[PDB]
Amino acid sequence: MVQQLSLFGSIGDDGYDLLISTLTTISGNPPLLYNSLCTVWKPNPSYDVENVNSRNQLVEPNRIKLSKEVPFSYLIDETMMDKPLNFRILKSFTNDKIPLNYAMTRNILWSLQISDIPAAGNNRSVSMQTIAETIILSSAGKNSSVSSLMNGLGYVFEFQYLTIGVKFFMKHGLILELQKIWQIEEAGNSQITSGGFLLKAYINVSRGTDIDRINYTETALMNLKKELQGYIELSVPDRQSMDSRVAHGNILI
Amino acid sequence: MNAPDRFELFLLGEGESKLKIDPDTKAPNAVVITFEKEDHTLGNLIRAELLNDRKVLFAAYKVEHPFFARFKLRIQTTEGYDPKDALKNACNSIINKLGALKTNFETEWNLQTLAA
Amino acid sequence: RAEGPEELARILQQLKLDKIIHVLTTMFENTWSCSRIIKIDKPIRTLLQRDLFIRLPHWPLNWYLILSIISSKTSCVVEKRIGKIVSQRGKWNLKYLDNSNVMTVKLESITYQKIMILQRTILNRIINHMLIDSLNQLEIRNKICSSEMINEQKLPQYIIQGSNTNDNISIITLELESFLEGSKALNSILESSMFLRIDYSNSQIRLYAKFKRNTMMIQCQIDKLYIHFVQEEPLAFYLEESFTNLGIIVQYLTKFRQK
Amino acid sequence: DDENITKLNKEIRAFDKLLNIPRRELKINLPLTEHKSPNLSLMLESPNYCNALIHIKFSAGTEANAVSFDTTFSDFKEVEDFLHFIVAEYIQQKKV
Amino acid sequence: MGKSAVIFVERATPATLTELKDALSNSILSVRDPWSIDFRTYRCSIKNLPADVSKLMYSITFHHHGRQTVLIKDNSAMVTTAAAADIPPALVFNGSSTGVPESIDTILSSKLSNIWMQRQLIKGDAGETLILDGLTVRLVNLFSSTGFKGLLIELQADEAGEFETKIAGIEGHLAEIRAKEYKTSSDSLGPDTSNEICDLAYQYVRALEL
Questions:
Q1: How many beta-carbon contacts under 8 Å exist across A and D?
Q2: Which residues of E touch B11 (CB under 8 A)?
Q3: CA–CA distance, A70 with A37 (Å, rounded to integer)
Q4: Fewer CB within 10 Å, N- or C-terminus of chain A?
Q5: Does the CB of C99 have a partner CB in chain D at under 8 Å?
Q6: Where in the cell is it found (chain D)?
Q7: Pick from E81, E86, E91: CB nearest A69
Q8: Inter-chain touch E146–B11, beta carbons under 8 Å
Q9: D71 and C112 in contact by Cβ < 8 A?
């Protein structure tokens, strides 16, 4: 469980290369390639959860995220082994098509994660969100599989998507991510972040009670934002967009 | 209504230790031991047995409020002798006495049944 | 981080003591199973005393070779004994200790060859001691015919015959009254002392007795009773039997007694 | 994955033969008759880069896996003492 | 491949553990650090369930095996960790994990409390572990909410050739102490797939069931 303090933004791919150089001028570090695959699961509507205390609202149903890393050998087509595995490959990832299709992901079926809507009030300068996390290491039995496990808990699959981007590690534990997101269905693959990169700068705090640390984290994030003034505008997203409860449906992408 | 549940008299809550031992800061070789979910039945027996050890100086117990099931015991023994060891000896002696008592009662009851 | 001069002196004394202990424990293990679990409430009566309890997997149960290391400011000695210890309700109880056969050995003289010779002889010594303990459980008095006792030639010569300096032959002197559990009517017929000779190589048990008076019944044929009379001593006879398990030897004795 | 991390891993691994702990092993085979050839394997290591640890494995000519003795030593004096004892034991075995 | 077995004695006495510790004292080679174990059962709170779907879920927490939880349901196992040192480096690197996870028991009893609710809890603390010749034996007293429950014995060996003989020997050792009602188990969850801790948890479940 962490308090994640975050700021968001977006950029057009035209400046992409330039942006990268500037980051290396500041951090002093080179970018590192990465990828991931997230699957979202929701409580089964076939089961009537009368246990939701309607007269008191002790709790509301929520959605579970399962993440995993996928090797690049599934994301590189027959035209791309010649180039080395570095960040420049992202320049060729502008098409809505991608080597990883629905059948391979179905064949695949980790990190389990749950979150809450950010803190209310208009006196917050950065998006503060609470995250509860655990890890699944292995399994066994006659039906050892992620799908069977989540159906045993009482959850069913809803959708999935694939993230590819680069990471920058700066001082004080600040992490800056440049991402491209591909939604995947049997109908096909569609790039929601079409013609651009999604930028997200964030820090993690282990204990929410410590307030000196939280103040330091906010100071670092606002200093970073004030450093990038004039190039990219980093902003607090909409509090109602980062809500992932089942009752109301929307997805920040 | 504010009447507490009765089962709190014999079921320990989670995170509760049946014994708690604390050194006493006033007299050397003295310990205060808190027992939980217990009443005079055990404290009187243990104190009466601890009064038979020639190396035991002080042994006293109390139940501060008759609402809560718990009591305190206080032990002080001679130098070179541990109060926990005294408690262990007392419990062993009590157990042996109760076993002998049970065997005697069973023998007498069977003899009466033969004479019944 | 030591604080006191007395603490420093104690630290150095313990350094010497456990350095010697480690050296000898390594010597034993490079050839022996020590025990690091046994703690006795009272140190064994024989200046720092340390008790080490060693044994082998094939030894009889609860029988331990006990070494009492006595360390002084300038000299150190070792007391080697054989004991029996049991564990009951979380306590170590010294069931039995032997003091008549304490081996007091200087630190310097101990070597590997002495260690292996002691390993070979200790099995026979422990067998003799457990036979003694069993006879004590039977309340039968006994005495060991040690190497010095045999060399002194005070024992009957026919018993010494066949013992060609073999550790597999053990002779024990038993009291006639004790072996008979107080039967005083047989004291006037047989000698008060009998001899039990056990050969592990032959796995044979012989009970030798001596007639106090020359009875003419010896002239009669007593071959059907499995009694063999000594040619050297006509007043001396013996009963011979073959044994497979030592734990049942008591029954054999009764059989002998029966005969 | 990324070029930089693999490059650094390669460059660092290139120095293993220098940075790694030195080791040595010596196998001694003694010529004995009656198809009973004991083996004496002594491996010398420096786990903390300064201290000498000698592991001795002496296998008597009885079985291929029945290791007669397997010990460790940190004092060269005890090493010499045990070597002398082993030599004496071998001489006695050859005399019996 | 190592093998393990679990024997549970229900009619044991408070001093039976000491009796078995002393009765084996001849072969005891060494003793190691104490251990602990937790055993929870979670119940399904939803009533619109099919007949063939089970209602329980057994969670077993191992303290000595690096703080690991195992969830068991219908012969299906799941192994979760909660230590920062057990995290595969890929998940830390790519961003799939914040680096400081929580135990799955907190997740079940905090966020999913409207689907699963706790029903019991059986604990074992301050057990003893003994090294015998090619064997390791662990003993502990089980305490429920009410009080003492019984005795638990778990045996682990590396060589599987003579496991049955060792189990028979330990059973005989219990036999001389006149503990005649004991339930043992050495089953395997999956004949083809062999995971040690999952099989251990399954054996615990099979031993502790009523």
A1: 15
A2: 145-146
A3: 7
A4: C
A5: no
A6: Nucleus
A7: E91
A8: yes
A9: no
